[PDB]
Design a binder for this molecule. Structure first.
Ligand SMILES: *[B]([O])([O])[C]([C][C]([C])[C])[N]C(=O)[C]([C]C1=[C][C]=[C][C]=[C]1)[N]C(=O)C1=[C]N=[C][C]=N1
Ligand SMILES: [Cl-]
Length: 263
């Protein structure tokens, strides 16, 4: 059985030509609205949230960990290094790496977070520790973006990611200083203007993390504070049947516009 919300999302999916996954959690009453909410999708750069959160968790017991400088070598650079390239043969702290990964989607920064956690499996272990049984990170940047249909590597479901994003930002999977820091980072994101944010009222505060990959994969996950109302969490994942498909951030904006009706 479908609601009008799910019917609108299905029509958007049909017009888009791809596969759309949506999960909305309304924290006023803990209700969820799902569309393909238990299907796996490639996370691409939305996985940077889990990596940054895992480092934040380590910092709860190592109080100066975020200020620890990490060396950036020429050989560390990968395909998209807008911040890290300014620090070659220098350093970035774990806080600076987290901010670069989250707010600019820097892939060298993400790889340093993964390395701090002992590899992709360390990010997955953190997910399991906070109750996320679905997330899996298998690869570093940039190979985590291959986004092959049917491949479970580097995937999660919309429901699982929405639940985790809620617990990380509004709940207490992290300590208070750390939860607030993650919110500060997400709110300052620079890459999200055409994605979920473009489908919501400008008066709503949004923290989000985008992602992109092969198969035209176009993703965004967000924590949202509507005016006068309890906050929401929204995941919008989108992937397409052909490898060379173009990005479709407009589909995410359209999904957000649908979800916002009545909220
Ligand atoms: B993330 O893992 O989603 C990451 C963020 C991006 C801004 C650097 N994405 C990528 O590394 C993708 C992978 C990709 C592979 C094949 C097809 C499409 C995408 N890279 C990019 O989107 C990209 C775009 N412009 C410059 C650099 N990188
Ligand atoms: Cl991105």
């Amino acid at each position: 059985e479908t609601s009008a919300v799910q019917q609108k999302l299905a029509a958007l999916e049909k017009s888009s030509g791809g596969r759309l996954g949506v999960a909305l959690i309304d924290t006023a009453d803990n209700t969820q609205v799902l569309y393909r909410g238990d299907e796996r999708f490639p996370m691409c750069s939305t996985s940077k949230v889990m990596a940054a959160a895992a480092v934040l968790k380590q910092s709860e017991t190592q109080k100066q960990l975020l200020n620890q400088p990490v060396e950036i070598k020429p050989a560390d650079l990968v395909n998209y290094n807008p911040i890290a390239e300014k620090h070659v043969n220098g350093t970035m702290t774990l806080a600076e790496l987290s901010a670069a990964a989250l707010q600019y989607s820097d892939n060298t920064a993400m790889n340093k977070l993964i390395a701090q956690l002992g590899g992709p499996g360390g990010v997955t272990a953190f997910a399991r520790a906070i109750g996320d049984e679905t997330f899996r990170l298998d690869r570093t940047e940039p190979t985590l973006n291959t986004a092959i249909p049917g491949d479970p590597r580097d995937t999660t479901t919309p429901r699982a990611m929405a639940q985790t994003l809620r617990q990380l930002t509004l709940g207490h999977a992290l300590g208070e200083t750390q939860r607030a820091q993650l919110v500060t980072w997400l709110k300052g994101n620079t890459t999200g203007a055409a994605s979920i944010r473009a489908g919501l009222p400008t008066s709503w505060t949004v923290g989000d993390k985008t992602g992109s990959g092969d198969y035209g994969t176009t993703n965004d996950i967000a924590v949202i504070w509507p005016q006068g109302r309890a906050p929401l969490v929204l995941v919008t994942y989108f992937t397409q049947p052909q490898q060379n498909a173009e990005s479709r951030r407009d589909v995410l904006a359209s999904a957000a516009r649908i979800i916002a009706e009545g909220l």
